[PDB]
From TrEMBL, chain A:
It comes from the Bacteria. The active site is at residues 33, 197. The lineage of its organism: Bacteria, Bacillati, Bacillota, Bacilli, Bacillales. Mg(2+) binds at residues 16, 84. It comes from Brevibacillus brevis (strain 47 / JCM 6285 / NBRC 100599). Residues 4-121 are annotated as: N-terminal hotdog fold. Involved in some intermediate steps for the synthesis of the antibiotic polyketide bacillaene which is involved in secondary metabolism. Residues 4-279 form the PKS/mFAS DH domain. Residues 135-279 are annotated as: C-terminal hotdog fold. It is found in: Cytoplasm. This is Putative polyketide synthase.
Length: 279, 273
């Protein structure tokens, strides 16, 4: 069987630690994640792939300086994907996720580094205070995914984890829930692609503040800290990094994934995003 | 699926290169290789496991050499499947140390690793070994001829029950301090010829043929082995008695040496009756 939905088989050799996966397009994280008519691997999937791969290769994880370079599109031909892990003497693990292109060449999709550090003691959020601060407008799930549909982003049942987005000033607070379609798979992932992708989806609220429609995908992430486990229902607090405003050539924001009580389970700092489509 | 009949899956981690295999006992190299009532992995299998493992770990050829191999413990597969592993440790001088072990299910205790085989490997060039004149060797080994029925009848009497897949001996020609054994892949397993480099049926048949030189028990050891070429459907095993060491040349129909083994040693036990 498979080691992990993103790690089908270990293919390590004397030179490199490596895992390999054949994505067909029938997996929920591809068939229900269609951007501009083509099934594309969610940005969140790469982080979970690197996390699981590191967990296997080692027998308090922090990612740093992650980049998303090229989308992994799965058309009529299955795609052979790989992740290689390079350990360094200082405890740092460099990962690279690529796929095999047919003419031999490797297509690079994501790079980054990881370190196993101690877990920081982040104080829990008062969700009541945040909800009041984000009372300018409330966006329903229908409103969010209607906007996405207009931008050419077709999210299937497994990737409609947004229940609603509470909009504030330079921040939004999004309520997330694992879709009932994929609850069976909750235990197969640490960072579930449905929840984590929904957290990144919720950055739409920052754009909806501007109202004027535009598609703004992330290309980089400065830091990610896994503090604890994810639950089926969570919250995403998204804030513009000081000095960053909506409409910038490169929009920078942070995302905190919190449990029902306001505990920070995953802290993401320094998303960088570029506008790729208007209206 | 499985990478190789002896390498089911790669399980390497940052610490070690590793492959793992769960043997059920239904495989031909276990059900047809019964010693003293137990299905046991043939000694020949360990070399093929190490060879296949090295081929995967290096990204795959010929010219491989094993040196200072030991066989310490038999891998018996009873009613419960057995979990086997091979770990490969590369060294700076180009040498690869391998260890083949299995997880023991000692109830009331915590699982422990049982070592079955150890050795080293090096990727070296192919030696230009002169072909043997099989006609001359057949003449030198004219003292006596043992048929297949005679050999495996003797084995059965000794408590060694070889099934169809491990009856590769067609006959043994007896000489002085040497024998020449005619080997053939049993038709039961000819389909699998391409799945192995060192096919366990042929290589085990070569080691079986050491019976011709007039009991041998574990631990075993091998000073050197050189893989020169591929194994064929029909082959010859030239066994020469060199302390308690003998050499085996696995040859094709024309006398070309495809596998050269030097310095097999096995513990000597008194023979009962
Ligand atoms: Mg590489
Ligand atoms: Mg080990």
């Amino acid at each position: 069987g498979v080691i992990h939905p993103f790690l089908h088989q270990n293919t390590s050799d004397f030179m490199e630690q490596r895992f390999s996966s054949m994505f067909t397009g029938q997996e929920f994280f591809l068939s229900d994640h269609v951007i501009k008519g083509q099934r594309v691997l969610p940005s969140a999937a790469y982080l979970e792939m690197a996390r699981a791969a590191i967990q296997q290769a080692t027998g308090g994880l922090r990612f740093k300086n992650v980049v998303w370079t090229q989308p992994l599109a799965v058309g009529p031909e299955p795609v052979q994907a790989h992740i290689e892990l390079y350990p360094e003497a200082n405890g740092e693990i460099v990962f690279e996720i690529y796929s095999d292109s047919k003419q031999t060449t490797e297509i690079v999709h994501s790079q980054g580094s990881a370190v196993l550090c101690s877990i920081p003691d982040i104080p829990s959020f008062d969700l009541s205070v945040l909800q009041e601060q984000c009372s300018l407008r409330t966006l329903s799930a229908e409103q969010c995914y209607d906007a996405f549909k207009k931008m050419g982003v077709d999210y299937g049942p497994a990737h409609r984890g947004i229940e609603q987005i509470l909009i504030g000033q330079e921040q939004v607070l999004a309520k997330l829930s694992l879709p009932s379609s994929v609850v069976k798979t909750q235990g197969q992932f640490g960072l579930h692609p449905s929840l984590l992708d929904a957290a990144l989806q919720s950055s739409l609220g920052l754009m909806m503040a501007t109202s004027d429609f535009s598609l703004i995908l992330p290309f980089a992430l400065e830091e990610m800290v896994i503090v604890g486990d994810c639950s089926s229902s969570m919250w995403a607090l998204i804030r513009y990094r000081e000095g960053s405003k909506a409409g910038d050539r490169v929009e920078k924001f942070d995302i905190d994934l919190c449990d029902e009580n306001g505990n920070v389970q995953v802290r993401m700092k320094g998303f960088s995003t570029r506008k790729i489509a208007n209206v």
